[PDB]
Amino acid sequence: MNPIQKAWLKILEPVSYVINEKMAKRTGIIGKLGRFFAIGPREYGVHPINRMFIFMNRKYMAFQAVALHRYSFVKSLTHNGFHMLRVFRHFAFVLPATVLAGLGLFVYWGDDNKCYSPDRFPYLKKRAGDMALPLNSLNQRTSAHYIEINAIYGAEMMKRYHKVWENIIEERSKATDQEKKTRYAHPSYQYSPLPVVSIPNVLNPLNLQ
Amino acid sequence: MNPIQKAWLKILEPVSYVINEKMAKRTGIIGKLGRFFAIGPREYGVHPINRMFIFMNRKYMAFQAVALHRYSFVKSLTHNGFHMLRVFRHFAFVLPATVLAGLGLFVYWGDDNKCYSPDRFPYLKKRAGDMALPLNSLNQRTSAHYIEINAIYGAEMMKRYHKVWENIIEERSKATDQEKKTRYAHPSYQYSPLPVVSIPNVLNPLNLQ
Ligand SMILES: CCCCCCCCCCCCCCCCCC(=O)OC[C@H](COP(=O)([O-])OCC(O)COP(=O)([O-])OC[C@@H](COC(=O)CCCCCCCCCCCCCCCCC)OC(=O)CCCCCCCCCCCCCCCCC)OC(=O)CCCCCCCCCCCCCCCCC
Ligand SMILES: CCCCCCCCCCCCCCCCCC(=O)OC[C@H](COP(=O)([O-])OCC(O)COP(=O)([O-])OC[C@@H](COC(=O)CCCCCCCCCCCCCCCCC)OC(=O)CCCCCCCCCCCCCCCCC)OC(=O)CCCCCCCCCCCCCCCCC
């Protein structure tokens, strides 16, 4: 039992009443269904994962005490405390340093947690859908400056083209059929008027600005 | 106590617990406020209207029994049962008929329930905001046929004017400035061309159909 199981019971108090008091004691399939989904304390409700941590925590911690509980290398240098000849005194702080580094075991796990991964090749294979790429893919690249600067450049110039596009359509509206068919036309073209028909001059077919 | 009061209790059951148990006895003002809005049997909760009906129902019913319990006028005609000389036998069924007519006392109460009120003058005052009108207002009236037939006529003719209006704007768009300024113009008008300017030909400024 734990607090989280007790919270479920308070929430499932009415459900426990329906299934246990009414259904569980009925005959037929309604009873088999209630006795099967009966609410209470858990049969085999232990959590092996939580129990696994407790075991490995206690076993690894006893190792820490042995590795960390060492006689000092510094105190053995004066030959006045407990150590005259210690030819392996320079190994005293190897296991302690090794245990202290274990604090970073999970903080630094895998390649991405030891470097800036976007600058490494594996990151690319992940962004391509876990797809194999040539090893020189990090070099054959287009400038990120161009892609973002050109996207702004193109849009800023379209705003200025929209204004110019309006003045041209306006000035062309005040032009005769003769001019709008001879200006910018091929020299070999002989103009021949067309029958006048009604064709509106709508800038944007959709009612947009 | 009645069922409607009991229904309030089941709905106010939790509210009663908060006022009568917690607020009604906490201390100071919260007590005076909870003891004032206490929940329980209604003090002076009787309904005089209910009793007023019960009393008048009983008194009027005792009158119905007397008025309806009369010796028959038909049986007294033969001079063979219980009645030889009854000079007021023709009054036997006056009170019975008068009581049976009482069943329409409330069904026919006021002028509106005895006739078709919209054909009566008082109805006009109610629709005019309870305002005095001349007695001959029911005669000075415009035909309801015209009001409703003209409302439909005007709309059916506008749908046909919209189509005619489009064909005219189209035929005029293909017209020269000289034609659209001299046709339908006054005879004494001398046409003088104006400088050409860009003025769109938009049917509806609002983007409607
Ligand atoms: C604003 C700030 C306010 C400041 C003021 C506040 C003051 C507060 C004071 C608080 C107290 C601070 C704690 C220290 C003083 C305590 C007083 C005392 O008496 O201590 C007794 C105390 C008592 O011992 P203990 O309690 O029984 O156990 C202590 C330890 O648990 C275990 O003890 P141990 O003795 O067993 O551990 C030994 C270990 C201790 O750990 C270390 O110190 C690491 C040492 C690694 C570096 C060693 C350098 C060796 C010589 C290099 C020479 C060149 C230098 C150039 C450097 C250039 C740099 C680029 O060192 C070793 O590993 C020894 C062997 C090392 C290998 C030797 C290899 C030699 C040959 C190499 C040849 C290769 C080159 C050849 C080229 C030739 C060309 C000519 O012992 C200590 O000294 C404790 C020190 C442990 C570290 C504590 C650090 C706490 C965190 C403080 C912040 C970090 C500061 C330290 C930075 C050091 C530089 C990186
Ligand atoms: C087809 C469907 C399927 C049917 C098949 C199933 C058949 C099963 C039937 C089951 C039961 C049927 C019920 C009837 C059978 C009763 C048999 C029996 O033994 O009962 C004895 C039964 C025993 O007495 P009781 O149980 O002690 O009490 C009985 C009553 O509670 C109270 O008794 P009461 O005696 O005290 O009531 C008296 C009352 C009874 O109420 C009435 O019957 C109303 C009477 C109105 C007609 C009066 C006729 C006057 C004579 C005029 C002569 C000409 C006639 C021309 C007619 C032309 C028409 C355009 O009559 C009066 O008020 C007498 C006073 C008359 C007014 C005074 C002035 C009279 C002279 C006025 C002259 C004016 C002339 C001026 C100008 C002249 C110029 C030439 O007495 C009855 O007679 C029971 C009558 C129950 C009421 C029946 C009528 C119900 C209303 C139905 C709606 C109207 C439809 C009929 C209209 C008729 C024409 C207006």
Ligand SMILES: COC1=C(OC)C(=O)C(C/C=C(\C)CC/C=C(\C)CC/C=C(\C)CC/C=C(\C)CC/C=C(\C)CC/C=C(/C)CC/C=C(\C)CCC=C(C)C)=C(C)C1=O
């Ligand atoms: C048949 O023989 C006869 C008698 O029997 C002997 C008589 O007693 C009598 C005497 C008659 C009387 C003493 C009764 C007189 C009654 C009169 C004058 C009118 C009474 C008027 C009132 C009591 C006020 C009522 C006010 C309203 C209805 C306005 C607000 C609306 C209300 C309250 C109801 C809401 C309206 C609805 C349509 C919803 C209806 C709701 C329900 C049915 C819910 C019912 C709930 C329950 C729990 C039963 C006669 C004349 C008679 O002929």
